Amino acid sequence: NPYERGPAPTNASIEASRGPYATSQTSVSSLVASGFGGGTIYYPTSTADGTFGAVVISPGFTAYQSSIAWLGPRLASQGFVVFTIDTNTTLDQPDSRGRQLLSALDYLTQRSSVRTRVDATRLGVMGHSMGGGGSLEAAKSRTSLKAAIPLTGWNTDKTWPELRTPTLVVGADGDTVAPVATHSKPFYESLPGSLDKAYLELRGASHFTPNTSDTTIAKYSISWLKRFIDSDTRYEQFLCPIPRPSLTIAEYRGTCPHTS
């Protein structure tokens, strides 16, 4: 597999706050950004191992990059180009957020100063709250996306039978803003039965747990991106068989074994 990056993984390496790649960052001003509010790109400094897949991340309603910034370095140091974006306005709805995720990927791969570090065929989307509902909208418009990860996602559209993108749905047991009963579980249950997918419900968490460093979110997000953006079968072991309920996991559902 030409897309494998970094050493063989262990449970410790996916839980680490800083992966094997040293990282750098650049800012993209809102003046230059076409179709979105600007953002920050986090990327491995080294070009010696080849190009990397890329992930764009959107914040939620009334939120800015500061709410999702901790994911930048944390994911990029595992061998990803990661773009945390601001939206045009903080009141934008999920469908608009989905269009902005795709415009940010377009900018990153076609016009940014790190476009030669990125493999434009291997892209993913992530978001928190309404941004998470936007990640589903983006995967509906662009079915070549390799991974989608909504974090305590919010969307009035509950059913997604069109998706072909492997999706990890992350919910929080105590979320009162986007309750898993009416947002996250319905999203998960409506995805095609043949799709590689998974539902992770955090234990003792709220709607704002994803806005601060969380080892459980990080380890499964890293594994999911490695497995599907890089096709890296060394990370399948963390996902299948599915994890059991624990101190940090309230519930986990999944289609194992994966067929991507």
Tokens of 80: 């990803």
Tally of CA atoms within 13 A in the half-sphere of 75 that contains its CB: 33
Measure the CA–CA gap between 207 and 260, rounded to whole angstroms. Answer: 31
Chain centroid offset of residue 34 CA: 22
Measure the CA–CA gap between 107 and 32, rounded to whole angstroms. Answer: 9
Domain ranges in the chain are: 1-260
Tokens of 245: 């309920």
Please indicate whether residue 129 is annotated as part of the active site: yes
Element (H, E) at 169: strand 167-172
CB burial of 74-102 (b: ≥16 within 10 Å; e: otherwise) equals: bbbbbbbbbbbbbbbeeebbbbbbbbbbb
Please indicate whether residue 207 is annotated as part of the active site: yes
Measure the CA–CA gap between 105 and 111, rounded to whole angstroms. Answer: 10
Catalytic option among 103, 207, 214, 230: 207
Catalytic option among 86, 92, 95, 175: 175
Task: Check: CB of residue 223 under 8 Å from CB of residue 238.
Answer: yes
Q: What angle, 0 to 180 degrees and rounded to 10, lies between the N-to-C axes of helices 94-110 and 130-141?
A: 60
Catalytic option among 77, 96, 129, 135: 129
Can you give the length of the chain in residues?
A: 260
Task: Check: CB of residue 83 under 8 Å from CB of residue 56.
Answer: yes
CATH number at 1-260? 3.40.50.1820
In sequence order, which residues have a C-beta less than 8 Å from that of residue 107 and are 6 or more positions away? 28, 33, 34, 35, 36
| Header resolution in angstroms | 1.9
Strand partners, 24: 43
Measure the CA–CA gap between 242 and 198, rounded to whole angstroms. Answer: 9
Measure the CA–CA gap between 134 and 128, rounded to whole angstroms. Answer: 9
Experimental method: X-ray
Task: Check: CB of residue 25 under 8 Å from CB of residue 39.
Answer: no
Task: Check: CB of residue 76 under 8 Å from CB of residue 5.
Answer: no
Residue 193 neighbours by CB distance under 10 Å: 8
